[PDB]
Amino acid sequence: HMPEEVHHGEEEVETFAFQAEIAQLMSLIINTFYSNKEIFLRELISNASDALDKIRYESLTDPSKLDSGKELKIDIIPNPQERTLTLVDTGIGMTKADLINNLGTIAKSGTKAFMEALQAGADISMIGQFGVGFYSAYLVAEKVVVITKHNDDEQYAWESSAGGSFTVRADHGEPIGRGTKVILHLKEDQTEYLEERRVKEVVKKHSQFIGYPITLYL
C-alpha cells in the first residue's frame, strides 16, 4: 500500500515576479554602500505605526474588529543565534490579495519616482517620502519574511531575497491574532542591529515620538 497524492489541489507555495520598478530598487538597496543604513528601523517602525493607525480608524465604527486583539503595540526582537531582527505590530494586517499587491505590485509608482529622485540628487533616507520605505529593510537584510494576519483572511507568509521574485504561502504556524511580523535575516556585516545597545540608540534617535509603545525583547 503506497498511495500517491498526484494533485494537492491549491498550489501551496506561489512564486511571483516583482514589477521591474520594484526589483530594480531592491537591487539598488541591497547592494548600496549608503553609510546611514540605520534608517531602515525608522521606516519599519513608521509602517508599523501606520498599520496600527489603520486598525484604530477601522475600529471606531466597528469595535468588533479588535476581537482579534485589543493592544496596539510594536515589538522589536533581535535574535543573535538565527541572525534575525523581527518587528511585530498588532495593526490591520494584510489579506493574501493585499499581500501580493502591496509588496509585489502597487509599490511600482513609488519605487520608480524614488529612483528618479535619487538620480537627480535625492538620498536614500528619503525613501519613506515615496511610500516604499518597506524595501529599506534590504539595507541590512539579505532576506525578508513577512507574516501577516488580517481579520478578513487567514494567516499568510511572504518572503524574498531580492532576486526579482517573491513567494507567498498560507502560514499554519503560531497564530499572531492580527497584525504583521517583519523578519529581517541580517547581512553578515550588519549584525550590530542584534545588540540592544545599538537598537535603542536608533529608536531614541529616529522614533522617539511614535504614538505607540515599542518593546525590545532580548
Cβ at position 104, least distance to ligand 42C in Å: 11
Q: Does 110 bind ligand 42C (CB under 6 A)?
A: no
Element (H, E) at 173: none
Q: Which residue is nearest to ligand 42C (CB)?
A: 51
Nearer to ligand 42C, 28 or 88 (CB): 88
How would you label 103-125 residue by residue, b for 16+ Cβ within 10 Å and e otherwise?
bbeebbebbbbbbeebeeebebb
Q: Does 91 bind ligand 42C (CB under 6 A)?
A: yes
Nearer to ligand 42C, 30 or 92 (CB): 92
- Report in angstroms the alpha-carbon separations of 177 from 29, 70, 155, 168: 32, 10, 9, 19
Q: Cα–Cα distance between 190 and 181 in angstroms, integer?
A: 20
Q: Does 95 bind ligand 42C (CB under 6 A)?
A: no
Footprint of ligand 42C on 30-59 (CB under 6 A): 47-48, 51
Element (H, E) at 132: none
Q: Cα–Cα distance between 197 and 194 in angstroms, integer?
A: 9
**Site residues (vs ligand 42C, CB under 6 A):** 47-48, 51, 89, 91-92, 94, 102, 134, 180, 182
Annotated binding site for ATP, which residues? 47, 89, 108, 134
